[PDB]
Design a binder for this molecule. Structure first.
Ligand SMILES: [Zn+2]
Ligand SMILES: [Zn+2]
Lengths: 90, 96, 110, 101, 183
RNA sequence: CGAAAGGGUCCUGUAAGCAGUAGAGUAGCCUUGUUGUUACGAUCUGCUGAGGGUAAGCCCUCCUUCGCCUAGAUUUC
């Protein structure tokens, strides 16, 4: 009986009661940023084997124009407005 | 799997199921001791060929408790409700 | 109902296929399990594995194969003359945040 | 450096428990019974040099004093200051109690 | 029969579970499993092993001060058997279990209050540092949306937001490498 | 039926990261000490019975996804 009276008093006082779109949006954006960081780290893990060999320097490897154009397009640069075709050697 | 002194409403199948068998949903026979087969195997139960001579055949069995904890490890809980009540609230409970 | 040229992304659970394997055979065995998985999934006995996928398998040495791996299997047409099989599968490794918790998904052609 | 580390966990190599050592520190009678279960002639130093905290006999007073400067003795002191795990604390961990009327 | 509890970890110890250590001073130690028994033989402290009820009570992660915890005790003075008393004890037992579950959930939520504020602050800091990694439109996509806007007389920002919503809906993953064409 | 996934059941033992008037002490800047302050600093505490693994000879899932299918070949009073 004492326990039930305590339960009624707590329920009257609001002991068991239970309770933002901007916060939800910023949490979703941070989750997207963490996913992008994980993808970048996976790329680095794929391209790095520094225990067994050294990475070939970037200046010694010819970079494909299609890959450069695709990466700049994903970054949001108008490649046609800058004319990447005349720059690329053959 | 309940008895007169253990009032928990529970079935014979252990927590997580019988290992490499599944669940017992049909009628079952509980035999004292061990039997020649393995799990999943056909068992032939036969009437005894002779009238018995021991008092063990005349004894009536009174079960106080049947274990229904997990046999996939060191199971300490007979029901999922008992495991939850001992454990308390988990992180995924508030996450849900 | 399914076309010949089709690409799907799968999660291969290599842990249960490499359970108990001799340590010096685990990565080659995982290569063969990837080939067998692709052959079972696509119906093609000609399976070709991307070298980046091979690097991903051998990333942690001969006995450090990952438990799960996300792959893209692309059934394509063999255009070479005098080929034994009309179709083949090409398997690549997929850059994902976490290989766990992913369903099989059809990759859009565009 | 533990002597014969392979069989350290055998029952025939068991050492005295921390709650027993706590009871030895609290009551000299319990320590007296524990020392009665031993034979003084076989003891190191004829049983004259004894550390209760480590439950250990030493060959000389200089050996006991030098042992008190070591980290095993200080580890035992820290364990005793934190307190030994007992049945009463095991009861309080699950929220059980004894009702004697 | 009765349910015991493990001395080391505090789990329920049903009959034929675990092992009992009989010490020469007169004390029995019931363990529910070989893990607890072997940690005891190695003389580890349950108060320091984080998976034990002893550690959880010492750290304050268990509800201890509660009226529902006063109903269970080792009864050293027996009561003459009474059928009505036993039946009402069963009913009270069920009610006490329900009330204890509710109060435990309240206790856990009071423990886990501040998570939302901490996570929101971390999210704001991460976004403010890495705004450039947020999803954007391609340059070619922006060009084609600009010329669609010029053709249709519509809001370029409107087609940009629609294409951003479509890009957020359509999720695609990148595949490493690529096939080398055979001769 | 197969491959995933989810839930359960077990195993371990509390992830990465961030924070803290916790931290023996040391060195700077000035209010020259009044958590004076800042910096470092094993460790400790919180987020966190969390993270990870889980059938390979564990269980469940018409009602969580994707795929497969009435073959082919050999032989028979
Ligand atoms: Zn000592
Ligand atoms: Zn235990």
């Amino acid at each position: 009986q004492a326990l039930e009276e305590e339960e009624e008093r707590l329920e009257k006082e609001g002991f068991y009661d239970e309770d933002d779109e901007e916060e939800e949006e910023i949490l979703q954006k941070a989750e997207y940023i963490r996913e992008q960081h994980a993808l970048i780290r996976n790329e680095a893990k794929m391209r790095k084997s520094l225990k067994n060999r050294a990475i070939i320097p970037r200046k010694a490897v010819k970079k494909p124009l299609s890959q450069l154009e695709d990466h700049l397009d994903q970054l949001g640069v108008d490649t046609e407005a800058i004319g990447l075709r005349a720059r690329a050697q053959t | 799997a309940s008895t007169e002194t253990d009032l928990t409403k529970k079935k014979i199948t252990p927590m997580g199921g019988f290992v490499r068998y599944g669940e017992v949903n049909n009628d079952y026979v509980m035999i004292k001791g061990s039997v020649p087969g393995v799990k999943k195997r056909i068992m032939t139960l036969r009437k005894s060929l002779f009238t018995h001579t021991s008092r063990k055949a005349l004894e009536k069995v009174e079960l106080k408790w049947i274990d229904t904890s997990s046999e996939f490890g060191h199971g300490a809980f007979q029901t999922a409700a008992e495991k939850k009540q001992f454990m308390g609230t988990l992180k995924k409970d508030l996450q849900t | 109902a399914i076309a010949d040229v089709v690409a799907r992304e799968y999660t291969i659970h290599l842990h249960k296929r490499l359970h108990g394997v001799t340590f010096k055979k685990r990565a080659p065995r995982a290569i063969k399990e990837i080939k067998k998985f692709a052959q079972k999934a696509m119906g093609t006995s000609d399976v070709r594995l991307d070298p980046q996928l091979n690097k991903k398998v051998w990333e942690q040495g001969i006995k450090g194969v990952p438990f799960r791996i996300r792959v893209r299997i692309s059934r394509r047409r063999n255009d070479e003359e005098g080929a034994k099989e009309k179709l083949y599968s090409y398997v690549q490794a997929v850059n994902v945040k976490n290989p766990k918790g992913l369903l099989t998904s059809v990759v859009e052609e565009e | 450096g533990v002597f014969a580390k392979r069989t350290m966990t055998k029952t025939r190599r068991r050492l005295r428990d921390l709650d027993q050592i706590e009871r030895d520190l609290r009551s000299p009678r319990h320590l007296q019974q524990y020392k009665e279960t031993k034979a003084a002639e076989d003891l190191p130093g004829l049983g004259l040099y004894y550390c209760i905290e480590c439950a250990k006999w030493f060959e000389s007073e200089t050996s006991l004093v030098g042992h008190r400067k070591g980290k095993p003795h200080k580890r035992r002191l820290k364990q005793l200051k934190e307190g030994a795990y007992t049945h009463e604390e095991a009861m309080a961990a699950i929220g059980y109690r004894i009702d004697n009327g | 029969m009765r349910i015991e509890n493990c001395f080391f970890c505090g789990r329920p110890a049903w009959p034929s579970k675990g092992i009992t250590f009989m010490r020469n001073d007169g004390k029995a130690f019931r363990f529910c499993r070989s893990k607890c028994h072997k940690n005891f033989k190695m003389k580890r402290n349950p108060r320091k092993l984080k998976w034990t009820k002893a550690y959880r009570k010492n750290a304050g992660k268990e509800m201890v001060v509660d009226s529902t915890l006063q109903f269970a005790a080792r009864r050293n003075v027996p009561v003459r058997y009474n059928r009505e008393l036993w039946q009402k004890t069963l009913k009270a037992m069920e009610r006490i279990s329900e009330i204890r579950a509710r109060r435990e959930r309240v206790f856990y939520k009071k423990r886990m209050a501040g998570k939302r504020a901490r996570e929101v602050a971390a999210a704001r800091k991460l976004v403010a540092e890495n705004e450039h990694l947020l999803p954007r439109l391609r340059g070619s996509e922006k060009r084609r949306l600009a010329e669609l806007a010029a053709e249709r007389g519509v809001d370029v920002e409107e087609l940009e937001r629609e294409e951003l919503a479509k890009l957020a809906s359509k999720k695609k993953s990148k595949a490493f490498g690529g096939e080398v064409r055979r001769v």
